[PDB]
Design an enzyme around this catalytic site. Structure first.
Site, PDB file in Angstrom:
ATOM      1  N   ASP C  57       0.837  -1.195   0.000  1.00 11.11           N
ATOM      2  CA  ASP C  57       0.000   0.000   0.000  1.00 11.11           C
ATOM      3  C   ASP C  57       0.882   1.259   0.000  1.00 11.11           C
ATOM      4  O   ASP C  57       0.530   2.308  -0.524  1.00 11.11           O
ATOM      5  CB  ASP C  57      -0.898   0.142   1.230  1.00 11.11           C
ATOM      6  CG  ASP C  57      -1.862  -0.998   1.436  1.00 11.11           C
ATOM      7  OD1 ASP C  57      -2.379  -1.552   0.449  1.00 11.11           O
ATOM      8  OD2 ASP C  57      -2.115  -1.347   2.601  1.00 11.11           O
ATOM      9  N   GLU C 181      -4.696 -13.645  11.374  1.00 13.36           N
ATOM     10  CA  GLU C 181      -6.044 -13.210  11.050  1.00 13.36           C
ATOM     11  C   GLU C 181      -6.773 -14.306  10.284  1.00 13.36           C
ATOM     12  O   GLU C 181      -6.424 -14.541   9.122  1.00 13.36           O
ATOM     13  CB  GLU C 181      -5.994 -11.941  10.202  1.00 13.36           C
ATOM     14  CG  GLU C 181      -7.364 -11.446   9.750  1.00 13.36           C
ATOM     15  CD  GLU C 181      -7.228 -10.131   9.000  1.00 13.36           C
ATOM     16  OE1 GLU C 181      -6.340  -9.320   9.352  1.00 13.36           O
ATOM     17  OE2 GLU C 181      -8.008  -9.947   8.044  1.00 13.36           O
ATOM     18  N   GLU C 217     -11.704 -10.668  12.839  1.00 13.90           N
ATOM     19  CA  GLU C 217     -12.421  -9.604  12.143  1.00 13.90           C
ATOM     20  C   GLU C 217     -13.920  -9.860  12.229  1.00 13.90           C
ATOM     21  O   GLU C 217     -14.312 -11.020  12.019  1.00 13.90           O
ATOM     22  CB  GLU C 217     -12.030  -9.487  10.658  1.00 13.90           C
ATOM     23  CG  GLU C 217     -12.875  -8.403   9.996  1.00 13.90           C
ATOM     24  CD  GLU C 217     -12.669  -8.266   8.505  1.00 13.90           C
ATOM     25  OE1 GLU C 217     -11.547  -7.880   8.146  1.00 13.90           O
ATOM     26  OE2 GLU C 217     -13.617  -8.525   7.741  1.00 13.90           O
ATOM     27  N   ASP C 245     -10.120  -6.291  14.253  1.00 10.29           N
ATOM     28  CA  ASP C 245     -10.570  -5.579  13.077  1.00 10.29           C
ATOM     29  C   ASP C 245     -12.078  -5.417  13.134  1.00 10.29           C
ATOM     30  O   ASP C 245     -12.820  -6.399  13.233  1.00 10.29           O
ATOM     31  CB  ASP C 245     -10.183  -6.330  11.796  1.00 10.29           C
ATOM     32  CG  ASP C 245      -8.721  -6.156  11.448  1.00 10.29           C
ATOM     33  OD1 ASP C 245      -7.999  -5.472  12.192  1.00 10.29           O
ATOM     34  OD2 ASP C 245      -8.288  -6.746  10.440  1.00 10.29           O
ATOM     35  N   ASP C 255     -17.661 -11.111   1.650  1.00  8.35           N
ATOM     36  CA  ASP C 255     -17.161 -10.196   2.676  1.00  8.35           C
ATOM     37  C   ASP C 255     -17.573  -8.776   2.319  1.00  8.35           C
ATOM     38  O   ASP C 255     -17.022  -8.197   1.390  1.00  8.35           O
ATOM     39  CB  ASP C 255     -15.658 -10.380   2.787  1.00  8.35           C
ATOM     40  CG  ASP C 255     -14.934  -9.568   3.833  1.00  8.35           C
ATOM     41  OD1 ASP C 255     -15.572  -8.919   4.688  1.00  8.35           O
ATOM     42  OD2 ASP C 255     -13.677  -9.574   3.810  1.00  8.35           O
TER      43      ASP C 255
END
Lengths: 388, 388, 388, 388
Positions: C57, C181, C217, C245, C255
């Site tokens: 990113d 995760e 999450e 999250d 999702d």
């Protein structure tokens, strides 16, 4: 400040809901049985407008016509003493082992005939008690395996059953309509007419479609992961929402039958918004079960809860629609443009309209944001009572 | 022994299936683009009967009418050289950012008009290429939030769009029908007309319902946890199965688009059984994606796989229905009685029939077993080729 | 009255959330890219405490070490100018086509080695930027088909990868911990370590389990239909909740990555209740996507929304626990007894205790109601701000 | 050709499976009760290796110690006459209304003590009957609402219960191990330790973790949409697969308990492949229910079906792994490379390996196809017996 129901709120309850003894597939009853008369009285005290019943809730299966008249008269006296109404009734075609392969679509033809005679008998009783809606939930119409049921023959048999009931009612001059109640599964592996959509499509094939609508249930559409408010809007659009069953469900799993407001709370908010906005005027029926963890005090708390949560959501949705900042956001998101005809000018004018294609600036259109998140946070703030 | 497709098997593929580059929401393309001409050639070699397309698969969005004619002529030459047909076409109303809030039901009215002009343009092209079915998949018609879309106004706009397309086709004298393709969700939070049922009910509200049917997709109904063969039977019952999309899906999750036969293999078996038994004669269309793990060799293996698995299931279901032990078991489970009218004698005779109620031995009826498990193990044995 | 976040609220956002361009599997980007520096600035203005990043990113894949230093210095200056922190970082092992079969568990051994070198490189960068938590989301570790992946060998390879990263960090003397995760599916058919439970069990098999925890999450556990607050309690119980999250999800489907508070609102309420009650002190990280219907104004409204809904729920849950009527209802439902040892007296005393069996009045015990519905309606009233 | 089970196949059945009377939440029993002795005899005739029981299946709740000895002796004689074994036993902590809020984690402490005494009593009985595995299914451990259960206190109570049972067994010198059986929901809204993963993580927190493993059930993991073969591989990897329950389930809905092979047939194929490949040597236990549509003949057909479908899949998976074309495809898909250490050379060598990063040709790696679709079509062909 507070949220007291009145019979003008048209809140209704099935005898079988508060009277559920707590038997589930893994366990024994945790509560003793309730006398129907006691239920009518307790519910009346809670502010309910009426009750509903299956034939077998009110008259024990295999009751002599003598016991029958007796059960009815007692019931009737309770209604007279309380002012409670009976707006809907229905047939139990699922509990007795004779219905293990269904009622109207059982492979055995003599069971199918029996199912229709049992139904007709209770339709007479329901008209007498003044019901305006007769509900049909084909809980056992379906299959666990592919070869057990030819679904086209079963739909033929289902249409045959409903057409015969329509003939009966018109021949008797009765003022009653039918509402089909879909459910995707349980207790059958897959149930026929599993969603509101399938039930709406089916009705259009009956001989007198005007006699039939749907009785959608919150938990049932959610067991298919579907958006209940959207399905209700389609039923309203079609003019077919004859009745509705309210409860709560936490996603795709067994039918939980939680009190209304439990489960998916935002979906309940948008459902109430739509019912009140569309002017739905039928009963607000609760088809739910107090959890078996509860004693009778918990039972009545759970039933009070249903009505209270509807009235709180009703207030919040009214507040949302009345809010000038919300009305400006609806315009910002162009809800007003959604309501305008796409092409009232007609086909040829649209075909000759260069601004609709040749000269449409697609890149500018694409760049307009819809402003949906701001609108939705306004809806959230109103739901949570956090508007400032 | 083996299972070679021929164009007589009417197996068809979308340009977008074998041409999928492998871009998913979490990752870049893993395969270079395919020229449509190359696809037509490779598929022809695999035994396919034809291809389908979205307007944007064949003519790059924003192509000059000159580039357009050029793209079409190349395509056409490939069809001529191979004998491939084009039985169905459809419009891409979902990829370009201008359709982010939908095409026919976008809140912005000028996007809705543009969506209709884009559609009409490709209907002309499809008629020219000889398509008999025009598919509409409203992939972006829906919402992520409750307030963003009034569903009754959106259904008004959807009916408006389809009625205008019906007017156009009849005014042009075209010989083409529409098939609406439902999907419950993705890429929108909830999509309008989410299941076959909802699409069937909707059609009955159009001005010329005879022009429209459904194009159900295996994976789509399964994303709602619904029984695909049951939904297909309802569409057949209604006379509305105009087309069908075959693929595989492993339950309720994102749309996997696996090759046909993958996913729920028993459901594929019962689907093929029903299509072949009912005499469905339209294309067997594969709307699927070779997994992005694959190179082009894996792409063509995956497409071959679709056709091979249909032909194996076709053989097994034919074997099942031809088996005298199965035909005896169907009678044992009374499938024959399911097909007989419940009450061809009519309402009054049924009401006067004491064997249907007063004298019905409910306890003996209840004790008859349905023999469904033996029937289902016969179906399993036939599917697995273990019959002995 | 109002709900303004401060950096003391430890609200954090991934660069990839507000920077999501709107590309989904069915459509093109609807928003231009954001410069990381711009995001840090805008978020700082909204009250956020910090940002997180994937290596890709912040530094475009295949950047020269020169471009790299440059990208970092710019970023760092933005952090210095705003006071924003970087508490967590992670590796993108899912976007580049080289990771199509996974990173740590790719069948190809040279891809697995590359995945580890890419990871280690960013761990150094994260330590430099001062991150305390390094997250690993094995988005591509899994399969679409049964034969493609031997799951025991893949778990061997996964443990090998994590043990090597643990060795590296300890050898470098770094003060950083890992958080695995989980996600059950998407973009792979099935992903390895699909739920918090599977990740917790796995960690206990690593060489230095104390270095690893979970980063659950909301939307991910809900894609398995699981109860997120329950899973978080198990992680807390195990002492392994290293990070979390937050977002919203409407059930079992793709999702959705909705802003926090959207989706299952009651689950968010019970989650906040638990985080605040348990004293969780790590970041409150939002891993979500502003819907592609939105322009940049909608983007920042959506991010503000996340923080606002946490602070409203925090207030309501605090109000619920502080309410003396609630504390009496907790005692009525015997939450106090749940917290007491079943048998602090030990095994032998329990075996000799006739009131625990021989003389236990099971019928009286069974008749006590749990009073759970009244407690839950109190929780509902507090959530909706309807307490009176 | 045919598929006859022998007791060497270690097929076992619970008394409660073939003895299920057909009571579901919507309907009365459709079958009379079975005497345990009759079941043992019928199953023995079908080729089963043994039976399992809940304490309450064998000795009616609230039996005098005299009736008890009598029930056991009869049972024992049936075992002696048939050669049937009892490899596993378990406690019913879910049917009696006293367990409506759970057994080990009931809020009421005296119910928790009672639950442990009821358990211990049956552990003695199971050791006597020679069981090697004691199963615990916490069917009522959970909640319908957020406030009803503090999950950290409940996990404390659960660990307390299991640690006390571990103490008891070691103090008695018994040779028996525990298997925890997870389920995500039903009959509770959400059940504690909902998946294999959560149960594995939990066990690692017990005082003597070596005494406990998991008893996963096909339908249960599938009710969470999880991949059962993957979860079983993780349990095998952990060395914790002590027992397994086989049945069939059609996706995310109520627990259907279909015979094994029904439901997701490809998942059954990959499960059998893994059990046989990993050398699992415990019982193959069927926890299923003959559908209530069936009479006793259908009951025994359904039980025969379970064993037959395992043996057919066993044959097909063995054929698949023995096929040289499959072994070449596994190498083509690099399953062999998955089994090799990523970095047996160690961390420093990996860090100094320029071919792992600086000089890794990522573009060539990315272009290699995984060849997974060809492998999967080979698996399909083998499953369907279409290999040529």
């Amino acid at each position: 400040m507070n949220y007291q129901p009145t019979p003008e709120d048209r809140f209704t309850f099935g005898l079988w809901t508060v009277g559920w003894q707590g038997r589930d597939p893994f366990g024994d009853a945790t509560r003793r049985a309730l006398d129907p008369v006691e239920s009518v009285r307790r519910l009346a005290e809670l502010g309910a407008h009426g009750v509903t019943f299956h034939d077998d809730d009110l008259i024990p299966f295999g009751s002599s016509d003598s016991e029958r008249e007796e059960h009815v008269k007692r019931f009737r006296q309770a209604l007279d003493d309380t002012g409670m109404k009976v707006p809907m009734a229905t047939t139990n075609l699922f509990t007795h082992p004779v219905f293990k392969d269904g009622g109207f679509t059982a492979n055995d033809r003599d069971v199918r005939r029996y199912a229709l005679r049992k139904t007709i008998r209770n339709i007479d009783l329901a008209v007498e008690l003044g019901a305006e809606t007769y509900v049909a939930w084909g809980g056992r119409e379906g299959a666990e395996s592919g070869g057990a049921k030819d679904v086209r023959d079963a739909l033929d048999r289902m249409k045959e059953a409903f057409d015969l009931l329509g003939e009966y009612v018109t021949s008797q001059g009765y003022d009653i309509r039918f509402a089909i109640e879909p459910k995707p599964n349980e207790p059958r592996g897959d149930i026929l007419l599993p969603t509101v959509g399938h039930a709406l499509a089916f009705i259009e094939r009956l001989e007198r479609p005007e006699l039939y609508g749907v009785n959608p249930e919150v938990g049932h559409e959610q067991m298919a992961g579907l958006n209940f408010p959207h399905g209700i809007a389609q039923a309203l659009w079609a003019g077919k929402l004859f009745h509705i069953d309210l409860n709560g469900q936490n996603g795709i799993k067994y039918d939980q039958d939680l009190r209304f407001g439990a489960g998916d709370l935002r979906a309940a908010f948008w459902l109430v918004d739509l019912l009140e906005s569309a002017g739905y005027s039928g009963p607000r029926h609760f088809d739910f079960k107090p959890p078996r963890t509860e004693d009778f005090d918990g039972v009545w708390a759970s039933a009070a809860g249903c009505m209270r949560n509807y009235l709180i959501l009703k207030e919040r949705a009214a507040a949302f629609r009345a809010d000038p900042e919300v009305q400006e956001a609806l315009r910002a998101s162009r809800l007003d443009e959604l309501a305008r005809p796409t092409a009232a000018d007609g086909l040829q004018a649209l075909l000759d309209d260069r601004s609709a294609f040749e000269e449409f600036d697609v890149d500018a259109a694409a760049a307009r944001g819809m402003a949906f998140e701001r609108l939705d946070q306004l809806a959230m703030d109103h739901l949570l009572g956090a508007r400032g």
